[PDB]
Amino acid sequence: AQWEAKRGEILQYAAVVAAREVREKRKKEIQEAGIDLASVQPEHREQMLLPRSLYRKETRRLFFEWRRSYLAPWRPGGLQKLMKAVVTMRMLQRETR
Amino acid sequence: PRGSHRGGVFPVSGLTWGMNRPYLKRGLYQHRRDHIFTPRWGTRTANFNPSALPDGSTRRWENDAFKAWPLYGLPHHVKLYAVNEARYLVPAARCTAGPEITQYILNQLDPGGAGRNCSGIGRPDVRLPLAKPAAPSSPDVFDPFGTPLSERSRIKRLYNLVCEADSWRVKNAFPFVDEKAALVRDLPLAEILYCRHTHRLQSRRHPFWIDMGYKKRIVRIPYLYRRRVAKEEAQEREFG
Amino acid sequence: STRSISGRLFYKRRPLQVPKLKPPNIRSKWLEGAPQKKGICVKVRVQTPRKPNSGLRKVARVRLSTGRTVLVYIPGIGHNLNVHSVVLVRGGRCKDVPGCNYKAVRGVADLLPVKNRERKRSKYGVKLSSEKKEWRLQRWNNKHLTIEKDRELFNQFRWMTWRNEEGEMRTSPLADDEEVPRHTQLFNRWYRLKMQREG
Amino acid sequence: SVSFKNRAEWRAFMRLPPKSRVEPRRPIPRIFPWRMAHNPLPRRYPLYKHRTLFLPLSLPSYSPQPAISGVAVAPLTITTNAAQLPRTALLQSAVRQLRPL
Amino acid sequence: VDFSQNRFPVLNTAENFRYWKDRGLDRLLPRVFPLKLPAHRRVDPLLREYIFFLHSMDPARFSIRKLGERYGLKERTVELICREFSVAEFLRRTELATPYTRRVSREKAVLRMKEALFSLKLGYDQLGDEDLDEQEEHEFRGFRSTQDWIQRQNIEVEMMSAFPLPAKRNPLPKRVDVDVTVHNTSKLKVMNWIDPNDKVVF
Amino acid sequence: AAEILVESAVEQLLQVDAVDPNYMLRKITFVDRDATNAALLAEAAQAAKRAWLPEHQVVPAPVYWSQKQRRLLDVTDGMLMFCRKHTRLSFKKHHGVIRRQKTHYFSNVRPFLWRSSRVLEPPPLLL
């Protein structure tokens, strides 16, 4: 419920971080490819440095990584861990008794 | 059977073939599922998302999904069940022959007994919504303790009927008179074969070749589309 | 309906009283229950079909291996059959020619297959030519065609991050004299796979 | 530890030990007594609808059946499925296995 | 409200037999009906994990019957839940395949899609809704359920009398052969072929 | 009801819930006057023995022998190369429609029918 309530702001911040990261990565890739950005038009340069596909993909990727990290404790192992710990403690008590 | 079909080949959908018909030539056309009833029980998205953030705003439920994935126990279900329970209990309620016949009618209406799960409506220890309140069941015999009457559980058959009724629920002028009209409409074969699946033909084709046909279509249909569109665009350019 | 089994001798009388129509395939009785028979052409000629049809039908009187002489139609366009020519004969009725009930199998014995034939080849004994085999493979070299919707979508979505066949990246949308590039991993996939599998 | 870089190595690993060509080598296939020859399967849309096995029970007896303990036992419907047996039918099946004979 | 010559207001009538089922030209309407889903795929995955833990820990105290009794499921459903969860956990912990790389059949992929949309629409059930021991209820369950196969008749024609009638001849259970294993080892399986008609048994 | 009764009795005698056991009840006798009900209770008690008592626990023979020969294997990354496929889904590539019914029956069905009675696979042996 908390994640759903704050969904919009989380996605906006994810978009900001993804924009920065994609700009850095695309600058590196263009440098490696050997294209000089001084010859590309500024309107072309902006799109090349922040392609829509990469920007949106990275935004969604970061959003869902944050979601999975937030909700990890309830993956198919956590309930088993918790119940095992509780049962072990109570069994230790009864064994001593 | 083996080999190609020898004889008359008709579309399995029931649609006619002709120059201005859905099919140009004879054939079975079992891959054409747009001519049969396939409910949309999932969601639908759009080609483009105008919003600047991928929020999944284009995704939306399909209209048939509300009938595919229903929810039971809704207030209108409860109200319908209440009215229908009153009407359905009318007979046992107004029976005035004797306890034996009353129990017989009650069992006929809602079977129950040892080893069975009933509504307990006729039980002396269950509360009912009587119009004229009376003794639960003269002064000599009663229950000296409190012992409130237990609630009555629903009639499963009637409740299921009420819940399933939803699947069967169905949702001046320009004075131009039609003279080339039909008095009693018409009932083609397609109207039946569209939704009554058991009347259609079962394929003798290999699923391998069915899948191969799908794979061929996925690569060839766009080329034909572009062929005709290119014809039209070249003609327009020449005219220009 | 049980008037035909009256008396004591029904079991011998009634089985005699039954339909007596001709056999379904009696038209080819001179094959002697065989799929086909070899014969020698005693006469080769052209006959006139029954009216209203007009023309000349290529026919031959042929002495089967059984010794019987029968009339046989020569299907197809053109033939080289002469007298003393051996032909394989199958059951087939040419309705035009009077009394003709058998046909000759093309491409067997001295009856050569029909020339300049490309359809119904199995019914005239024509093999699949090497040119046809080569074309049945070179035919599916897919052609690249555009409708300017590809151009719009490429300049709107794809040009931003695109890779050339050599791996080069694009730095500008499609010009007016540049065709929409092919997809390096999807265009002509089947033909390319077959060529690479061959070598 | 073994690395199967190609299918030949996988075949070599999976191959059974050699056996004489005079003994039975191939297992005899299973034959199910309800689909001995055809194996119906579905070939018509919908291809994945739910199919439920139904085996008719009909009326095993047509005479008055006294109650077992308190359960009625006597039949009330013809639609009972023999692959989804009810409580009282299972009770009868259990009592029969306990009869002294 | 139509007419009836006799008074029998129940649900067990030819009119009410298959209630709501089309009986006219509406049989050709393309109606949409609710999709059926397994209970072991309707219950919430966390409930599945809890059931699997209980069973894999103490299958005696947490019997299949007891788990089904507590969580409103059937024994077959509990068994399926445990099998599926054990398979998934084995794959995950051995790092053989993820939940989206195990090769499955088209039918099971479609079933997964069905349950995904069911959860997205209504949400997973937090408790079972089945019955442990189904009841003898008069319901239409296919064409096989509408007739007496042994009698080979759909209609019981009978006379009107106020006195007892001759009883109907009861059927006799079919005596079919069975195989019962009697000795199984790591090498040999020996089973007795039984013919229930053989009078001399020894 | 018999299963519930016997299982509850066993659990209480074992004091499964209690963290501080109170061992007071030690003899529980289910007495019934009906032969059928007593036999059903006996069957429930037999099932309870099978479930609880390690002596009476049973297992299918294939599982018993497989676990008796149980071994620990060492699977590397190169050993699963051909345990994985190119396709995401599996489906039957050929229909089951027989082209020649009598020929199929004579060639692939009849020769393996050594008896005309229809018998199912036997239930597994419990060890």
Add this chain to the structure above:
Amino acid sequence: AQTVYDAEKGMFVREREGVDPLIKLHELRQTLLSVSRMMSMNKQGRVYYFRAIVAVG
């Protein structure tokens, strides 16, 4: 006059005499079993008309 508007068609359709007006024509359907081209002979030659068989229920 003597016409009824059909919602699905969106147009008016005439009311035909001989038909019973109580009958609701919107819940009847028809099928054409056969249509044939019959012939007659007159002084000038041959006259063609048509016959049809239709089932309504």
Add this chain to the structure above:
Amino acid sequence: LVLGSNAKSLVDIPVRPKPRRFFDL
């Protein structure tokens, strides 16, 4: 009646085989 070019078959570029990623129990 333009239908395409066909001049560039694109056969020199190999078609990468699909990976074996899906596990079969």
